[PDB]
Amino acid sequence: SKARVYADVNVLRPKEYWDYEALTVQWGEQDDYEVVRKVGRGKYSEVFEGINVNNNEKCIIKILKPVKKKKIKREIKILQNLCGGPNIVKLLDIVRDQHSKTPSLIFEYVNNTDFKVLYPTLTDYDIRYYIYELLKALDYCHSQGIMHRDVKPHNVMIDHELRKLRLIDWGLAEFYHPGKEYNVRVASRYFKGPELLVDLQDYDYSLDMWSLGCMFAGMIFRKEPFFYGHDNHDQLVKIAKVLGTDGLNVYLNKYRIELDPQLEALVGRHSRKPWLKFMNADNQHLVSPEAIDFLDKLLRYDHQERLTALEAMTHPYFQQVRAAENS
Numbered sequence: 001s002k003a004r005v006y007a008d009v010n011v012l013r014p015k016e017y018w019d020y021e022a023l024t025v026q027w028g029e030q031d032d033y034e035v036v037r038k039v040g041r042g043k044y045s046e047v048f049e050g051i052n053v054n055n056n057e058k059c060i061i062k063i064l065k066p067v068k069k070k071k072i073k074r075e076i077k078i079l080q081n082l083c084g085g086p087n088i089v090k091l092l093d094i095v096r097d098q099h100s101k102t103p104s105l106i107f108e109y110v111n112n113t114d115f116k117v118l119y120p121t122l123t124d125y126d127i128r129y130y131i132y133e134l135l136k137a138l139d140y141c142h143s144q145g146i147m148h149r150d151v152k153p154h155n156v157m158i159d160h161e162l163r164k165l166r167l168i169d170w171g172l173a174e175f176y177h178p179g180k181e182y183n184v185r186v187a188s189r190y191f192k193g194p195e196l197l198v199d200l201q202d203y204d205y206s207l208d209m210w211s212l213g214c215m216f217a218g219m220i221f222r223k224e225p226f227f228y229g230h231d232n233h234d235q236l237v238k239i240a241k242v243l244g245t246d247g248l249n250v251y252l253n254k255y256r257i258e259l260d261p262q263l264e265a266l267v268g269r270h271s272r273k274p275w276l277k278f279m280n281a282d283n284q285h286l287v288s289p290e291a292i293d294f295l296d297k298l299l300r301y302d303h304q305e306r307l308t309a310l311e312a313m314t315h316p317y318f319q320q321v322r323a324a325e326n327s
């Protein structure tokens with residue numbers, strides 16, 4: 001299986017564009033940036049709001065924990081390749097501690113509102129607007145030969161007042177190479193595409209489209225998250241109970257994949273459930289045939305069947321957002 005779009009980007013570009021292992025970091029000054037308060041974390045970082053001592057402007061300081069240097073260079077190189085793209089978080093500086101050589105990535109500050117509180121407050125149009133902006137970031141990174149691999153609300157910073165969105169967290173992102181087998185241990189469980197759940201390793205940019213679909217379904221159906229599995233097996237089951245086991249079987253046969261016998265047993269058999277059966281009173285002002293048509297074209301087992309980011313931005317669902325932009 002190969003990507004249907006942007007397959008040759010890294011093929012056509014110089015090795016230095018994608019060979020993140022060769023990257024040579026030019027360190028900035030650790031003193032230029034000081035910590036104000038902790039604002040987030042991951043298994044391999046602590047993230048703080050900070051201030052640029054030189055101009056008193058806010059910034060974000062992502063202090064990285066010990067990991068193979070290759071993992072750090074990858075995040076850095078990807079950020080460097082994408083810096084300036086639409087709605088991509090900007091990496092402003094890279095510094096380290098002189099004694100521990102503890103590295104910190106310095107980013108632009110986004111005055112984010114916790115998604116758990118922000119989303120229930122978004123209007124139908126807000127949803128359309130933010131998904132559109134998020135789509136711009138994804139088409140951009142796909143166009144630059146990169147797969148994000150961790151699309152989820154926690155990695156989408158929104159300054160709601162400034163209607164500004166930034167796709168952050170490029171720490172699991174990879175360069176797309178035709179026919180490469182990737183590690184399937186990426187993305188948050190609730191946002192993992194079928195391909196990851198069934199060991200299809202030759203995946204591509206379309207994985208990010210499943211994740212976006214999951215985010216979108218959560219927003220319009222007001223169900224965070226929408227596919228709530230306890231572990232990877234249970235995640236495939238949660239998907240199968242909505243999408244149906246028919247399409248799954250078609251999918252696995254198309255790609256020659258044997259499901260693990262115990263997994264096959266957990267999944268069982270399920271009818272495809274229509275998207276309106278998730279319709280209720282809290283979400284109603286939010287679903288419409290165009291929302292459903294768009295969602296349906298994202299949440300497909302077959303990654304090759306999913307809309308591309310580009311196609312998605314042209315879907316009728318976003319016509320009002322396009323119109324506003326065009327002025």
Ligand SMILES: Nc1ncnc2c1ncn2[C@@H]1O[C@H](COP(=O)(O)OP(=O)(O)NP(=O)(O)O)[C@@H](O)[C@H]1O
Pocket residue numbers: 039040041042043044045046047060062089107108109110111112154155157168169170171
């Ligand atoms: N540029 C930013 N502006 C505002 N807040 C941010 C920014 N970057 C990170 N944060 C916050 O810090 C949190 C963690 O940052 P992130 O880069 O995602 O760390 P991580 O270690 O890669 N986390 P994980 O998602 O578990 O991989 C985010 O979810 C945000 O809430």
Ligand SMILES: [Mg+2]
Pocket residue numbers: 042154155169
């Ligand atoms: Mg994150």
Ligand SMILES: [Mg+2]
Pocket residue numbers: 042150169170171172
């Ligand atoms: Mg991360």
